[PDB]
Write an enzyme that holds these catalytic residues in place. Structure first.
Site, mmCIF file in Angstrom:
data_model
loop_
_atom_site.group_PDB
_atom_site.id
_atom_site.type_symbol
_atom_site.label_atom_id
_atom_site.label_comp_id
_atom_site.label_asym_id
_atom_site.label_seq_id
_atom_site.Cartn_x
_atom_site.Cartn_y
_atom_site.Cartn_z
ATOM 1 N N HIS A 83 -9.151 3.139 1.331
ATOM 2 C CA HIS A 83 -9.845 3.259 -0.034
ATOM 3 C C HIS A 83 -11.243 2.900 -0.195
ATOM 4 O O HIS A 83 -11.901 2.701 1.249
ATOM 5 C CB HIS A 83 -9.291 2.079 -1.272
ATOM 6 C CG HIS A 83 -9.165 0.743 -0.918
ATOM 7 N ND1 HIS A 83 -8.442 0.303 0.072
ATOM 8 C CD2 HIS A 83 -10.034 -0.137 -1.425
ATOM 9 C CE1 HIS A 83 -8.493 -1.115 0.016
ATOM 10 N NE2 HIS A 83 -9.775 -1.110 -0.636
ATOM 11 N N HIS A 85 -13.531 0.349 -0.901
ATOM 12 C CA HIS A 85 -13.701 -1.019 -0.388
ATOM 13 C C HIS A 85 -14.271 -1.060 0.935
ATOM 14 O O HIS A 85 -13.875 -0.503 2.067
ATOM 15 C CB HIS A 85 -12.855 -2.185 -0.555
ATOM 16 C CG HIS A 85 -12.555 -2.337 -2.220
ATOM 17 N ND1 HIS A 85 -11.564 -2.622 -2.801
ATOM 18 C CD2 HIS A 85 -13.546 -1.873 -3.446
ATOM 19 C CE1 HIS A 85 -11.326 -2.937 -4.219
ATOM 20 N NE2 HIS A 85 -12.842 -2.266 -4.565
ATOM 21 N N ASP A 87 -13.416 -3.377 3.294
ATOM 22 C CA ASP A 87 -12.603 -3.716 4.405
ATOM 23 C C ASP A 87 -11.863 -2.366 4.937
ATOM 24 O O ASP A 87 -10.918 -2.301 5.757
ATOM 25 C CB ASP A 87 -11.513 -4.727 4.118
ATOM 26 C CG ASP A 87 -10.833 -4.353 2.859
ATOM 27 O OD1 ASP A 87 -11.368 -3.967 1.832
ATOM 28 O OD2 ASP A 87 -9.594 -4.544 2.656
ATOM 29 N N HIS A 146 -3.940 -1.243 -6.279
ATOM 30 C CA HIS A 146 -5.224 -1.899 -5.740
ATOM 31 C C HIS A 146 -6.256 -1.442 -6.053
ATOM 32 O O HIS A 146 -7.264 -2.179 -6.575
ATOM 33 C CB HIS A 146 -5.102 -2.179 -4.309
ATOM 34 C CG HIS A 146 -6.168 -2.973 -3.855
ATOM 35 N ND1 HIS A 146 -6.276 -4.430 -3.969
ATOM 36 C CD2 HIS A 146 -7.292 -2.586 -3.154
ATOM 37 C CE1 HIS A 146 -7.475 -4.882 -3.535
ATOM 38 N NE2 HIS A 146 -8.134 -3.815 -2.880
ATOM 39 N N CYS A 165 -4.567 -2.158 0.753
ATOM 40 C CA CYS A 165 -4.466 -3.117 0.059
ATOM 41 C C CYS A 165 -3.471 -2.980 -0.975
ATOM 42 O O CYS A 165 -3.085 -3.956 -1.828
ATOM 43 C CB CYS A 165 -5.800 -3.446 -0.254
ATOM 44 S SG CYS A 165 -6.786 -3.867 1.218
ATOM 45 N N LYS A 168 1.092 -5.626 -0.249
ATOM 46 C CA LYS A 168 0.911 -7.112 -0.121
ATOM 47 C C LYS A 168 2.043 -7.537 0.834
ATOM 48 O O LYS A 168 3.098 -7.172 1.052
ATOM 49 C CB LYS A 168 1.131 -8.000 -1.480
ATOM 50 C CG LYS A 168 0.047 -7.603 -2.516
ATOM 51 C CD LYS A 168 -1.289 -7.973 -1.875
ATOM 52 C CE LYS A 168 -2.483 -7.538 -3.066
ATOM 53 N NZ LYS A 168 -3.718 -7.754 -2.730
ATOM 54 N N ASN A 176 -7.380 -9.784 -5.048
ATOM 55 C CA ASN A 176 -8.626 -9.123 -5.777
ATOM 56 C C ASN A 176 -8.369 -8.069 -6.707
ATOM 57 O O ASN A 176 -7.951 -6.985 -6.221
ATOM 58 C CB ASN A 176 -9.754 -8.739 -4.961
ATOM 59 C CG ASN A 176 -10.736 -7.779 -5.643
ATOM 60 O OD1 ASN A 176 -11.272 -8.093 -6.713
ATOM 61 N ND2 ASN A 176 -11.114 -6.924 -4.778
ATOM 62 N N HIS A 206 -3.784 -6.899 4.057
ATOM 63 C CA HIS A 206 -3.905 -8.183 4.547
ATOM 64 C C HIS A 206 -2.797 -9.125 4.890
ATOM 65 O O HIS A 206 -2.003 -9.029 3.921
ATOM 66 C CB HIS A 206 -4.949 -9.117 3.906
ATOM 67 C CG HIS A 206 -6.144 -8.399 2.997
ATOM 68 N ND1 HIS A 206 -7.303 -8.399 3.742
ATOM 69 C CD2 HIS A 206 -6.236 -7.532 2.052
ATOM 70 C CE1 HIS A 206 -8.204 -7.693 3.005
ATOM 71 N NE2 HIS A 206 -7.706 -7.290 1.924
HETATM 72 ZN ZN LIG Z 1 -9.833 -3.380 -1.530
HETATM 73 ZN ZN LIG Z 2 -8.348 -5.258 0.937
#
Ligand SMILES: [Zn+2]
Ligand SMILES: [Zn+2]
Length: 224
Positions: A83, A85, A87, A146, A165, A168, A176, A206
Site C-alpha cells: 500500500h 504508506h 513502511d 488498513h 498492514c 494484524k 493507525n 507489524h
Molecule cells: Zn500503513
Molecule cells: Zn503499517
C-alpha cells in the site's frame, strides 16, 4: 533443502521462514507513533527474487538488495508495494537505482503521488501475477481495510502470505486508522481467509508471524 542465510543487525533483521522465503524487518521512527517494526517478504527461486514492501529506508533497502545478490545468489526481479504508506515505499529509490522495477496498484500509485512519497513505477488493477524462477508470485486486492488500496502477497508453492498492514499480529491493537475503512475490514479479511484456506505462514505488516489464525484474529479485532 536450502541454506539458512538469516542474520540480525540493529537496523535490519532477515529471517528464514520456509525453504524459499525470508522475512525482512526494519524500523520506522515517527514523532506520533515512535519506533515501529515493519515486516516485508522475500521469495525466490532459480536465481530470481521478488520482494514485498521496501525495507524502511534506502540504507536498509541497499543492504537487502546486496544480500539477495551475495547470499541468495539471486537477482531482485521486482519489488511490490502493498500500500502507499512509507513502511511499503520508503526505500523505493534504492531499488530504482539498481534498475529493479517496482509495482503497485494504480490506486496505490495515485496515493503516493498525492502524498509526495516515492512512487512505484509499474501499475496494475486488482491483481499482478509474476514468476520467480518457475514459481508463481501473486499480489492482489481483496477489499479495503488498513487503507483503501492495501493488497496482499501470496507465494503458493510454499503457502506463505504477506498480509501487510491489513493483517494484524495476534492480540494486536487496531493501530493507525487514519486512512482506514474499518467497517469493511472484517469482510475483506474474511474474503482472504475464504480464498487462502490452506495458508501455512501469514506475515502481518507489524509483529509476530504466525499462521491462518492471524486472519481470524484480525476479523475479530474489527468485528468487536
Ligand atoms: Zn500503513
Ligand atoms: Zn503499517
Amino acid at each position: 533443502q536450502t541454506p539458512d542465510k538469516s542474520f540480525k543487525t540493529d537496523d535490519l533483521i532477515v529471517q528464514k521462514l520456509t525453504d524459499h522465503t525470508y522475512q525482512h524487518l526494519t524500523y520506522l521512527q515517527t514523532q506520533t507513533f515512535g519506533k515501529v517494526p515493519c515486516n516485508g517478504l522475500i521469495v525466490f527461486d532459480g536465481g530470481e527474487a521478488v520482494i514485498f514492501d521496501t525495507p524502511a529506508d534506502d540504507a536498509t533497502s541497499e543492504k537487502v538488495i546486496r544480500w539477495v545478490e551475495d547470499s541468495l545468489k539471486c537477482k531482485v526481479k521486482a519489488v511490490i508495494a502493498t500500500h502507499f504508506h512509507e513502511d511499503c515505499v520508503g526505500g523505493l529509490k534504492a531499488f530504482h537505482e539498481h534498475g529493479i522495477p517496482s509495482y503497485a496498484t494504480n490506486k496505490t500509485i495515485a496515493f503516493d503521488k498525492e502524498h509526495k512519497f516515492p512512487v512505484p513505477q509499474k501499475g496494475f488493477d486488482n491483481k499482478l501475477e509474476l514468476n520467480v524462477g518457475t514459481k508463481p508470485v501473486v499480489a492482489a486486492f481483496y477489499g479495503e481495510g488498513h487503507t483503501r488500496d492495501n493488497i496482499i502477497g501470496y507465494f503458493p508453492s510454499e503457502k506463505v502470505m504477506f498480509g501487510g498492514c491489513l493483517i494484524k499480529e495476534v492480540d494486536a491493537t487496531k493501530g493507525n486508522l487514519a486512512d482506514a475503512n474499518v467497517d469493511v475490514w472484517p469482510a475483506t479479511v474474511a474474503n482472504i481467509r475464504k480464498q487462502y484456506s490452506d495458508v501455512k505462514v501469514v506475515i502481518p505488516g507489524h509483529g509476530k508471524i504466525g499462521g491462518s489464525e492471524l486472519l481470524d484474529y484480525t476479523i475479530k479485532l474489527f468485528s468487536q
